[PDB]
């Protein structure tokens, strides 16, 4: 895939620096269009960053900050759109790279960057950085007033080499010959927003951005608005003319391209767009395919459980005792769940009591989270996450720190117990620094994820080779060695049969306590009135008409405890009176009343 | 694969009526354009009536207008010709055909309608045996039947070449009579006998007379 | 009417050159705004083209190609919008006019053309064309980058005369004095997109295109966006202010004007626009007026039959044996039907069998086509188009070749048989080269068409004076000499009475087989139990209570076959036993049971 999420962690120091770069790597490996912000922060000196080399286009901002690395290989980046801005002003922010052989970014090397659509540039405190003052930023900007939002520090600890002798007019992104700045705006003819040269015939189509290779709207280096299968357009496709032409029907607007159908975890709108959140007056219906769609409520919209980052909890940063009751009986939360140290310690500033462990019971019904699950603190009483026993999907439509849909850190649970979890819609999982936690690598994460660009990042849990004995590794009866915790009630898939929650070797088909039939690998009880059979099948189903033989009397076709004595199967039906045989089959009574009948007959009717 | 198999012919008294079927396979009669064509013995082809069942357009020749009704049942995929108040000069072989381009491409086999006052008579079949060469002839005699036609085949249609079935002759008695012969090697007599299969439909007679050298 | 459709046939050689110009003539006669592409192709030398002289405005492109004619009189054309482009690039394409006294276009004479909103100009291979290189195209273009999409060949077989001495600065569209180029852009003051002169006070309103006669937004020569009853506006008309002003309520956006109600064959949207196709999640309801409107589905949208040029058949060019079954039981197709030689011959490249004639049965239920019907091949077995027996309307919302809603060519059917066809919503009908086909001129086309700008174009069918005898002309009983084929079952209107499908002289009112009453010119059967009357009316309706006299017994108020004998008209009603009179009237029985009664009474109750 070419389109990937950004991050949203700004200048915050990494939650686990051990696996921070791995996060970045998985996130951007192969990615071309970053649907969000490109944040390259806190990168060590030797850092291998070749996974960035396909990034062509960024929607949000680009933030390169707090790095000791000498260069970030972003040579193919053509356009940042600035749909979101750093510090609400900047589309490109290069901050604090290197301390106040030596560490720090030396060159920018954004050799292809020829369009910043919105916001300015902020470059500050980079003691090793050269050539940033060289660039004619005006050209890159879409409008000139973006110059008024630009601050470029040139304080520097080293002398810079000149631009390559092969450089046009002393403007470059680095010492290389292919590092010269390519001007596509200020160097143009007549009208022309972008040109490939100074002649009128070198103008790019009205609909290009960054530049072009020719005059047609298919020669664009970037689309100003929308990419319709290699053609830049103002809109995603009411007809006026009496005909039909090629280029398929109508499309959904997803990011800055028109696409046939919305990508995996998104939602199609009536307005004709893809989204991770529906508008007001709108539900969310699942098609038989699994496809999701926002649509207007026919009645007044029914009750909806909003999690964090949604509705009244949009500012609220964690599940506390103040809002825990809001999730009572919720099968599906629209938003995220976050449990922080402050959840269980309880903020003593506000009159908010520390949340007690048994209050987490509210989540027992929970099956779906649209946002993310984040657990950085958990009660020391609880050995596992069994309160989330029934959670099936975490969509990850909202990702914690813009990257993780499931984070478990610093917990000291011994096992997971998330035994219904079958899907992580999108985003990465992070499970780190849980010193007691086993059963992390007995989970088939490959099957929980959807796209193959997501992964589990793990470090400083209980060592894998130390999860070996009983109560520390999967039970014998777990199929393919997969489980969420210890014992035959924690298997992902069941090797043999299930009796309720438990994996069992055999059902009691031929021998045992109460006899059983099997149905879809499930042990299920015969009817009490079935007669257990010697080494043979006792029953075929749960109903009393499915016995091989009756334990007491038989009342065609049922095995009964006693023969009917004045029962009426319903109103308006006359009562049914019966008596047993020498064999045991219930027999109908004769002439009505006087001798109301039973075995040897009784009066009183 | 496109076929028209017609039926319903036979004997009728003057003034009486008769209905002819024309069952189709390989195409829909309803959307098609079905035509009836007759041929009095020893005469040219004569157009009789037609039908475009879907459009409802039915057409008749001045000769038969008011006496004949053309129709079609769609479910049976069959066209019919109802003929009332029949007369001597209605005696003919009636064909049904399918319009195509601007001709009739698929035709029925043709059924024979005979308008007469004489009643149906069954044929008696008599053997014609060779005597005491190189190549010798044998055959059957289908004598005294009415009306036409009679079908003669040999060994259930297995023997074809050498066979001559003569066109029937009208006798002084008003009944028909024909002979059907076949030539076979004079060294085949005895250990190779031949059966002629006479069929006079109007009387329901299926005679299998084995001819033997005697 | 002023607004007309374009064509969409590009460089394709005319399907019948005999009546090609007549097509153009009917299409454009009186037309001012071309809602589509203006394609003037393959015009012979003497061609009379004065019908183009009112064209003022073109939405799509203008394609003048393959003509031997010396000029096209397009002097009033002010603006081409380029909503559609030729070869995806060009708004004006003038190609191959004249061979590689002599034929060919000599001058362009677009003396009023002062705005091309989108796309460039392509002028090539016109050996007689002069002055095209003279024009300052930059002025006409809306943006300068449109220059980069311009190719103007000047290879020429003749010397050109100079522009009229009265020409500004040697720029003209022809030798005439009124042929000089009027510059409205490059010659302007200050800001100003269009001006009527070089002073600041000569600027046209922000909302004009092509130029103007004054500064007000009512002085525009063309509207840049929308024409609101002589006022150019950015939008078609949520209120903020506490008042009410003139200029009627709100409008629908149709083409580039705001109108009160959508034109005849269009569809109004909730979004407030006219269209020939509804969006997804949308049906199409007919108001009691006959007015059509797109509206959201309250339930999930029900099954819909899509024809060609729609949904999965949008690329498919003809009805074949591969998709014939898709139309089973369709009463109304949304799209078009096309039957081509390849339909019945069957493409042997793909494993697609030739379509058999009896497979066309699927269309027997069909009543409506939104698109067009096109038949260029038909099975030789079928004498007519009776499979389309029940087709009532062909809307023509999509027109074949952008012009025809009904085309019948090269068929060799003998008659039409489209006996339910009452409406051709829009577009022309073309019926040509059917050498055997009569009953073409016995159809009242004047009544099938809606606007009087549409017509039937016919040539090389069976001569009119050769459709004279029986089976070749209308039946005596057809009213006004109108019919779809031969016989009293093909009349358009029925002269006397209808018995089912057939036109008849008289109903069997006074005499005949089974007696009949008449109801709305329809012969209908009396009840079998009615007694036929001597030269008098036999019944008044179909019910057995509507007889003049009974054939058997009477059971008030019904004529019955036999008197009721233990019938109960419903449950909970006691059975009704009766007996006949000497006259014949059914009489009620006496005391209940013992003598259960009938005529002379019977036991067993
Ligand atoms: C270039 O850098 C100088 C400072 O020089 C040095 O490098 C920096 C990256 C820091 O590590 C500095 O500690 C170091 O000296 C910047 O000059 C400084 O600018 C600020 C305003 O932006 C001046 O304001 C002062 O602020 C202090 C503390 O708030 C007050 O006490 C002062 O009264 C005064 O208002 C400051 O004077 C000045 N520093 C010096 C050395 O005098 C400079 O901003 C930077 N250039 C750019 C373009 O970013
Ligand atoms: C003006 O016209 C000339 C050609 O002159 C003549 O008029 C034309 C309308 C045609 O009828 C020609 O057959 C006739 O000679 C155009 O010049 C031609 O241009 C093309 C490229 O556009 C040249 O390319 C050639 O292509 C051929 C075949 O593919 C190759 O074999 C050659 O190797 C070569 O690549 C071609 O050389 C050239 N023709 C001549 C005569 O040499 C010209 O394009 C046109 N001007 C404009 C502005 O349209
Ligand atoms: C606008 O978006 C379209 C998507 O429809 C882009 O077209 C795609 O771009 C690729 C790469 O430029 C094209 O080439 C192909 O690339 C793939 C992967 O690298 C390679 O395997 C193929 O051999 C081929 O070279 C291709 O036209 C097209 N790819 C697909 C699968 O749709 C286009 O790049 C975008 N343009 C702009 C203006 O941003
Ligand atoms: C914008 O559209 C409006 C339509 O509301 C146009 O106004 C119409 O234009 C005509 C012709 O210019 C005007 O004059 C009238 O013409 C008719 C027909 O030629 C003639 O019979 C009358 O005598 C009269 O002169 C009239 O104002 C108006 N017509 C009607 C019936 O609405 C206007 O032309 C368009 N303007 C632009 C900027 O394109
Ligand atoms: Cl480095
Ligand atoms: Cl001319």
Is residue B58 within 8 angstroms of chain C, CB to CB? yes
Of A158, A147, A393, the C-alpha closest to A265 is A393
Burial string for C113-145 (b: 16+ CB within 10 Å, else e) reads: bbbbbbbbbbbbbbbbbbbbebbebbbbbbbbb
Distance (Å) from the alpha carbon of B28 to chain C's nearest alpha carbon? 6
Using CA atoms, how far apart are residues C17 and C15, in angstroms rounded to an integer?
6
The protein residue with its alpha carbon nearest to ligand 3, atom 5, reads A229
Of A141, A24, A134, A26, the C-alpha closest to A79 is A141
Q: Other CB atoms closer than 10 Å to residue C374's CB: what's the count? A: 23
Write the CB contacts of C46 (distance below 8 Å, at least 6 apart in sequence).
none
Residues in chain C whose C lies over 2.5 Å from the next residue's N (breaks after): 100, 237
CA A476 distance to own-chain centroid: 31
CB C91 within 8 A of CB C82: yes
Instruction: State the distance from the centre of ligand 6 to the C-alpha of A298, rounded, in angstroms.
Output: 64
Chains contacting chain B through 3 or more C-beta pairs under 8 A: C
Using CA atoms, how far apart are residues A483 and A469, in angstroms rounded to an integer?
14
Residues paired with A394 in a beta bridge: A369, A424
Q: Which CATH architecture has domain A1-182?
A: Alpha-Beta Horseshoe (3.80)
The protein residue with its alpha carbon nearest to ligand 4, atom 35, reads C230
Residues in chain B whose C lies over 2.5 Å from the next residue's N (breaks after): 132
CATH class of the domain comprising B1-117? mainly beta
Is residue B55 within 8 angstroms of chain C, CB to CB? yes
Of A89, A100, A164, A167, the C-alpha closest to A128 is A100
B118-214 has the same fold as B1-117:
yes
Is residue C486 within 8 angstroms of chain B, CB to CB? yes
- Between chains, do A298 and C296 touch, taking CB under 8 Å as contact? no
CB C200 within 8 A of CB C189: yes
Residue with tokens 């390849």: C342
Please tell me the number of the ligand nearest to residue C47's CA. Answer: 6
Using CA atoms, how far apart are residues A391 and A422, in angstroms rounded to an integer?
8
CB C602 within 8 A of CB C595: yes
Is residue B52 within 8 angstroms of chain C, CB to CB? yes
Using CA atoms, how far apart are residues B35 and B6, in angstroms rounded to an integer?
12
Give the 3-state secondary structure percentages of chain A, helix then strand then coil, rounded to 5.
10, 25, 65
Burial string for A118-146 (b: 16+ CB within 10 Å, else e) reads: bbbbbbbbbbbbbbbebbebebbbbeeeb
Is the beta carbon of C227 within 6 A of some atom in ligand 4? yes
Q: Candidates 3.40.50.261, 2.60.40.10, 3.40.470.10, 1.20.120.420; correct CATH number of B118-214? A: 2.60.40.10
Distance (Å) from the alpha carbon of C148 to chain A's nearest alpha carbon? 4
- Between chains, do C269 and A238 touch, taking CB under 8 Å as contact? yes
Radius of gyration of chain B (CA): 21
Q: Best mutation site among C35, C212, C230 for ligand 4, i.e. most ligand atoms within 8 A of its Cβ?
A: C230
Using CA atoms, how far apart are residues B114 and B149, in angstroms rounded to an integer?
10
CB C530 within 8 A of CB C536: no
Query: What CATH number labels A470-605?
Result: 2.10.220.10
The 3-state secondary structure of C525-550, one letter per residue: ECCCCECCCCCCCCECCCCCCCECCE
SS3 A587: strand
Chain C residues touching residue B59 (CB < 8 angstroms): 470-471, 486-487
The protein residue with its alpha carbon nearest to ligand 3, atom 36, reads A230
Chain C residues touching residue B100 (CB < 8 angstroms): 380-381
Backbone angles phi, psi at C332, to 5 degrees: -145, 115
Using CA atoms, how far apart are residues A560 and A580, in angstroms rounded to an integer?
11
Of A60, A32, A196, A48, the C-alpha closest to A117 is A60
Cis peptide before B147 (omega within 30 of 0): yes
Using CA atoms, how far apart are residues A360 and A61, in angstroms rounded to an integer?
39
Using CA atoms, how far apart are residues C193 and C155, in angstroms rounded to an integer?
33
Residues in chain B: 214
Domain ranges of chain B: 1-117, 118-214
Residue with tokens 């540039």: A121
**Strand C90-95 to strand C120-124: parallel, antiparallel, or no bridges (unpaired)?**
parallel
Pinpoint the alpha helices (H) of C370-460. 445-448
Decide if domain C302-469 falls under CATH 3.40.1410.10: no
**What is the torsional sign of CA C532, C534, C539, C542?**
positive
Using CA atoms, how far apart are residues C309 and A185, in angstroms rounded to an integer?
43
Of C459, C465, C433, C431, the C-alpha closest to C445 is C431
Is residue B21 within 8 angstroms of chain C, CB to CB? no
**What is the torsional sign of CA C215, C219, C221, C227?**
positive
Domain ranges of chain C: 1-182, 183-301, 302-469, 470-605
Method of determination is X-ray
Q: Do chains C and A touch (3 or more CB pairs under 8 A)?
A: yes
Q: Which CATH architecture has domain A183-301?
A: Ribbon (2.10)
Please report the resolution in angstroms: 3.2
Ligand 3 pocket list (CB less than 6 A): A 220, 222-223, 227, 229-230, 232, 257
Size of interface B-C (CB pairs under 8 A): 64
CB C255 within 8 A of CB A240: yes
Please, is C340 exposed, middle or buried when counting C-beta atoms within 10 Å of its C-beta (0-12, 13-18, 19+)? Answer: middle
Burial string for A213-245 (b: 16+ CB within 10 Å, else e) reads: ebbbbbbbbbbbbbbbeebbbeebebebbbbbe
Structure tokens belonging to residue A434: 């849980």
First to last CA, chain A: 83
Instruction: State the distance from the centre of ligand 4 to the C-alpha of C220, rounded, in angstroms.
Output: 12
Backbone angles phi, psi at C334, to 5 degrees: -105, 90
Please, is A358 exposed, middle or buried when counting C-beta atoms within 10 Å of its C-beta (0-12, 13-18, 19+)? Answer: exposed
C314 closest CB neighbour out of A204, A205, A244: A244
A302-469 has the same fold as A183-301:
no
Chain A residues touching residue C273 (CB < 8 angstroms): 238
Q: Best mutation site among C99, C122, C124, C155 for ligand 2, i.e. most ligand atoms within 8 A of its Cβ?
A: C155
Chains contacting chain A through 3 or more C-beta pairs under 8 A: C
Burial string for C401-412 (b: 16+ CB within 10 Å, else e) reads: bbbbbbbbbbbb
Alpha carbon of B53 to those of B58, C487, C489: distances in Å? 8, 12, 11
SS3 B114: strand
Using CA atoms, how far apart are residues A451 and A586, in angstroms rounded to an integer?
63
Chain B residues touching residue C386 (CB < 8 angstroms): 31, 52, 54-55
SS3 C97: coil
């Amino acid at each position: 895939t070419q389109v990937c999420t950004g991050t949203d962690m700004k200048l915050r120091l990494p939650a686990s620096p051990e696996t921070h770069l791995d996060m970045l790597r998985h996130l951007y490996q192969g990615c071309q269009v970053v649907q969000g912000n490109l944040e390259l922060t806190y990168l060590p000196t030797n850092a291998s960053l070749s996974f960035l080399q396909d990034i062509q286009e960024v929607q949000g901002y680009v933030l390169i900050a707090h790095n000791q690395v000498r260069q970030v290989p972003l040579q193919r980046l053509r356009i940042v759109r600035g749909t979101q801005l750093f510090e609400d002003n900047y589309a490109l922010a290069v901050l604090d790279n290197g301390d106040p052989s030596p560490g720090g970014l030396r060159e920018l090397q954004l050799r292809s960057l020829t369009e910043i659509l919105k916001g300015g540039v902020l470059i500050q405190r980079n003691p090793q950085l050269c050539y940033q003052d060289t660039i004619l930023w005006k050209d890159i900007f879409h409008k000139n007033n973006q110059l008024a939002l630009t601050l470029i520090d040139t304080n520097r600890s080293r002398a810079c080499h000149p631009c390559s002798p092969m450089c046009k007019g002393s403007r470059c992104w680095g010492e290389s010959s292919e590092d010269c700045q390519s001007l596509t705006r200020t160097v143009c003819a007549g009208g022309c927003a972008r040109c490939k040269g100074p002649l009128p015939t070198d103008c790019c189509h009205e609909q290009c951005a960054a530049g072009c290779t020719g005059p047609k709207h298919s020669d664009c280096l970037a689309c100003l608005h929308f990419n319709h299968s290699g053609i830049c357009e103002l809109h995603c496709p009411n007809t006026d003319t009496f005909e039909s032409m090629p280029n398929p029907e109508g499309r959904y607007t997803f990011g800055a391209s028109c696409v046939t159908a919305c990508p995996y975890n998104y939602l199609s709108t009536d307005v004709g767009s893809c989204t991770l959140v529906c508008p007001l007056h709108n539900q969310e219906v699942t098609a038989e395919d699994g496809t999701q769609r926002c649509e207007k409520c026919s009645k007044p919209c029914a009750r909806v459980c909003y999690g964090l980052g949604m509705e009244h909890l949009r500012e609220v940063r964690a599940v506390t005792s103040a809002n825990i009751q809001e999730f009572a009986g919720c099968k599906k939360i629209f938003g995220s769940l976050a449990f922080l140290p402050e959840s269980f310690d309880g903020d003593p500033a506000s009159n908010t009591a520390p949340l007690q462990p048994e209050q987490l019971q509210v989540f027992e019904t929970l099956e779906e989270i649209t946002g993310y699950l984040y657990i950085s603190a958990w009660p020391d009483s609880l050995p596992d996450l069994s309160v989330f026993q029934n959670l099936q999907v975490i969509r990850g439509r909202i990702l914690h720190n813009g990257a993780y849909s499931l984070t478990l850190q610093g917990l000291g649970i011994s096992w997971l117990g998330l035994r219904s979890l079958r899907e992580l819609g999108s985003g990465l999982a992070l499970i780190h620094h849980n010193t007691h936690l086993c059963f992390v690598h007995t989970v088939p994460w490959d099957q929980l994820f959807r796209n193959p660009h997501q992964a589990l990042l793990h470090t400083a849990n209980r060592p894998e080779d130390e999860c070996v004995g009983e109560g520390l590794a999967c039970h014998q009866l777990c199929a393919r060695g997969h489980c969420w915790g210890p014992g035959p009630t924690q298997c992902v898939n069941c090797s043999q049969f299930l009796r309720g929650q438990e994996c069992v070797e055999e059902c009691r088909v031929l021998q045992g306590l109460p006899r059983e039939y099997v149905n879809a690998r499930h042990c299920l009880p015969c009817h009490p009135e079935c007669q257990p059979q010697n080494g043979s099948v006792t029953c075929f189903g749960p109903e009393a008409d499915q016995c091989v033989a009756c334990a007491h009397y038989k009342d065609p076709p049922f095995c009964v405890a006693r023969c009917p004595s004045g029962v009426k199967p319903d109103l308006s039906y006359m009562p049914i009176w019966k008596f047993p045989d020498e064999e045991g089959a219930c027999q109908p009574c004769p002439i009505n009343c006087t001798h109301s009948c039973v075995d040897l007959d009784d009066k009183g009717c | 694969e496109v076929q028209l198999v017609e039926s319903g012919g036979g004997l009728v008294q003057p003034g009486g009526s008769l209905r002819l079927s024309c069952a189709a396979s390989g195409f829909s009669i309803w959307w098609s354009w079905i035509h009836w064509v007759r041929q009095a013995p020893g005469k040219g082809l004569e157009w009789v009536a037609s039908i475009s069942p879907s459009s409802g357009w039915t057409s008749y020749a001045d000769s038969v207008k008011g006496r004949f009704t053309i129709s079609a049942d769609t479910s049976k995929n069959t066209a019919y010709l109802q003929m009332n108040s029949l007369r001597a000069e209605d005696t003919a072989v009636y064909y049904c055909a399918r319009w195509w381009s601007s001709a009739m491409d698929y035709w029925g086999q043709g059924t024979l309608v005979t308008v007469s006052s004489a009643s149906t008579k069954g044929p008696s079949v008599f053997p014609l045996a060779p005597s005491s060469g190189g190549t010798a002839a044998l055959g059957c005699l289908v004598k005294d039947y009415f009306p036409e036609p009679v079908t003669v085949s040999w060994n259930s249609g297995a023997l074809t070449s050498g066979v001559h079935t003569f066109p029937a002759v009208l006798q002084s008695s008003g009944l028909y009579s024909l002979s059907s012969v076949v030539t076979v090697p004079s060294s085949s007599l005895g250990t190779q006998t031949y059966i002629c299969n006479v069929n006079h439909k109007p009387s329901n007679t299926k005679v299998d007379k084995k001819v033997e050298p005697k």
